[PDB]
Design a protein around this ligand. Structure first.
Ligand SMILES: Oc1cccc(Br)c1
Ligand SMILES: Oc1cccc(Br)c1
Ligand SMILES: Oc1cccc(Br)c1
Ligand SMILES: Oc1cccc(Br)c1
Ligand code: SF4
Ligand code: SF4
Ligand code: SF4
Ligand code: SF4
Lengths: 444, 420
């Protein structure tokens, strides 16, 4: 008889001993956020379908407009009609409602405030004094259980804790000056150093974003995307599940930072800013890094978004997990073969960055992310084909042989999506039991 | 199968709310939360304050005394603190307990000034005429979007203006948040022949073309509500209010980007229970709540008003009225004796009730009086209701994303056949 799937048992079987799994060498240095393909001058500008050179997202806009007018849901993908094409882009656009400029990357701006003091919720609750009263709990075991329970309330499908490895914190963030209003933000972006100093609280000066030396821990959350929608990549419905999950990320950060603050600690939100989420997720045990460059989780494969919160709250670090992803990616290469831009390498991992967009000095598969971004204006979306085709994105990968869990080696249209299965937040009740949590799952 | 149950209990079309000739639209300031006769309550020291400040004083007293609720010892002070920290954090995306001020803060009646609208402006989705006017296809699209936006239940009704507040509680537009509670005002909500929802110095104006209301149910966590009137019931209440706010904003933006207008509301604009009953989410009950088949009354409500053409859902009758006629459990367990044990009438018990509709008449000033005494939002009635079926064990026990329960989550799966 088939053994009932047990996601907790799977995670226990593949748990590692303590220690960051990322292999580094001496040339590793912290990475300036401006170097990402989204922001760097060498990659920021892309032609639209008329050959006009524009900021990449404006060229992508031109393609969305063209597709709606032509009744298409993606590149050379006809929709049922113009109304369906329109609906997919309306859903995508709406999904981003709680996200600033595609990722919330500006630290201590807008939703990503490093202090709760000015928030309407903090002001309303000020008479109770929860943000002023010293912590009543300092035991890391109890704090880990409390904060993980809160994380699940706040919309995380996965949550893990690691010691903060500063190698993955950006050396300088992309941000805007404090007096710049939103409508000028994309014109007034600047770099600002992120530094660690002996100070009591996270603070921003004119010159620096200062994280306290007491900022010991990072809490990493996984926000599950919708499988049916992502499997339409590179078309519009994959864009929509991406977009909605960015707003879920923002809610998570704000909810959890407020909880931590009301417990008597400080908390720094981040979403896509501050540091490299995949590295934190690997160190916090959510999953393993992969050929495509994403964190692959046992529950969702790479079809999951990441956000993280930094804190001085005492916590128990989770153990890394090794469920064989590295060895599978070594012989799989499906994402590399299916990538429409040939951005993903078919070669071995190296320590040497492929271009300015990669951080050298850590052993990883080196992908050309300027090629990736170049496909987004061409397709009018955020692609995602690599996530969509990855065997680990399939819901059907885990089997039990009578002794232990293992990966099934056999694993290696949009109208129907609109007319088909959906549930709250795009979660899937056929698999939602996999993320149930009791105290034993939160702290050991 | 929940889809089969709901089809089995579908009624013929027609509002199931019985009214008479005396029914008039209700001024929002009359609720116990806001009315001057109910607003001020003593704290445990005998100091008269705004009721929520007196309740704050009780939360502080409980933390210092290591309690999770009235006469309910916590495991230790740390556990007491954690429950209140979770409650306070849950409210992060909600203004002044319910987002009631229309066209303020998160509840904007136009998307034009939102950061997301400005970012997306070159696509022109909010300025392009609708490409779909077919109510069937629109109902399927908007219900799919509603589920993406966090609704566990969604229904559509024609807008019955009897349940829209005659006058809203709001603040002047240029008043900063810091002075909001001190400068609340009343403002009429009126329906006129105008293209778009609009606010003047004198009126909140809803277009006469605003045909429909979309009602969402946002499920609370059962284990946490079972701790009522203690702190963890407060926490699941609070988190769902922030879920409500995000739902309203997400769905309003979707509707706007489809070429229509959309008015969010959360706890403002009109009476959610009446809308939910007319939209088929559930039936009204003795306690006054909308009882749903999936969650009983343990579900929060929000709603969005729109001119988007839609197919109204049918009201449902699964026997709630006949059950509450004999049950009376909420009324016997209510710590304030707010809930009547008598029959339904058309006559309100006090200013806080809207007369003219056949309902169980409850004393809602008695209910609110228990909140400063208990330091929370009670909820004992929701907790004890048959349809709904210690704190250390809750913190150490089962949880899942947003507090949803995988044992039951299949019941809210949705395919096109059950959307339209
Ligand atoms: O960080 C991301 C992911 C997907 C789309 C966009 Br724009 C930004
Ligand atoms: O009306 C008031 C006075 C003081 C604090 C708060 Br919160 C509200
Ligand atoms: O509408 C509500 C519900 C619960 C608490 C408070 Br304050 C307001
Ligand atoms: O930098 C720009 C210019 C015009 C529109 C948008 Br969105 C961004
Ligand atoms: S598609 Fe294959 S090679 Fe690529 S990330 Fe997934 S398992 Fe690894
Ligand atoms: S998102 Fe698309 S273009 Fe980018 S790496 Fe993945 S498959 Fe290639
Ligand atoms: S919330 Fe509590 S006091 Fe209010 S009606 Fe329900 S049981 Fe009674
Ligand atoms: S407890 Fe009984 S009388 Fe009260 S609302 Fe529930 S079913 Fe009705």
């Amino acid at each position: 008889a088939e053994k009932e799937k047990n996601a907790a048992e799977i995670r226990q079987q593949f748990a590692m001993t303590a220690g960051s799994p990322i292999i580094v060498n001496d040339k590793l240095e912290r990475y300036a956020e401006v170097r990402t393909a989204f922001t760097h001058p060498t990659s920021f500008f892309k032609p639209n379908y008329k050959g006009e050179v524009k900021p990449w997202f404006l060229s992508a806009y031109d393609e969305k407009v063209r597709q709606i007018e032509n009744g298409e849901n993606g590149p050379k993908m006809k929709a049922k009609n113009v109304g369906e094409a329109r609906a997919g882009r309306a859903l995508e656009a709406a999904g981003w409602t709680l996200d600033i400029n595609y990722g919330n990357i500006y630290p201590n701006r807008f939703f990503m405030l490093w202090s709760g003091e000015t928030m309407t919720n903090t002001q309303l609750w000020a008479p109770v004094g929860l943000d002023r009263r010293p912590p009543d709990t300092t035991d890391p075991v109890e704090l880990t259980n409390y904060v993980k329970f809160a994380a699940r309330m706040a919309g995380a499908d996965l949550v893990g804790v690691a010691r903060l490895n500063r190698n993955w914190v950006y050396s300088e963030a992309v941000t805007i000056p404090a007096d710049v209003p939103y409508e000028q933000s994309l014109h007034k972006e600047i770099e600002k150093p992120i530094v660690f100093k002996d100070v009591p609280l996270p603070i921003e000066t004119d010159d620096e974003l200062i994280i306290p030396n007491t900022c010991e821990n990072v809490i990493v959350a996984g926000i599950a995307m919708n499988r049916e929608m992502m499997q339409t990549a590179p078309n519009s419905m994959a864009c929509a599940t991406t977009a909605f999950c960015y707003s879920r990320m923002c809610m998570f950060d704000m909810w959890l930072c407020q909880f931590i603050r009301y417990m008597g600690y400080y908390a720094i939100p981040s979403c896509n800013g501050v540091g490299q989420s995949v590295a934190f997720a690997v160190e916090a045990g959510l999953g393993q890094a992969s050929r495509m460059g994403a964190c692959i989780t046992p529950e969702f494969g790479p079809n999951v978004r990441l956000t993280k919160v930094f804190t001085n709250m005492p916590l128990v670090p989770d153990k890394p997990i090794d469920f064989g992803v590295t060895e599978f990616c070594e012989t799989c290469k499906k994402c590399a073969r299916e990538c429409p831009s040939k951005a993903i390498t078919e070669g071995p991992r190296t320590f040497e960055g492929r271009s300015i967009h990669n951080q050298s000095g850590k052993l990883q598969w080196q992908n050309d992310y300027n090629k990736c971004l170049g496909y987004w204006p061409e397709s009018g979306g955020y692609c995602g084909v690599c996530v969509a085709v990855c065997p680990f994105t399939k819901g059907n990968i885990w089997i039990h042989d009578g002794v232990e869990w293992l990966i099934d080696n056999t694993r290696f249209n949009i109208t129907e999506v609109w007319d088909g299965k959906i549930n709250t937040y795009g979660l899937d009740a056929d698999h939602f039991r996999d993320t149930v949590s009791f105290r034993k799952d939160r702290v050991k």
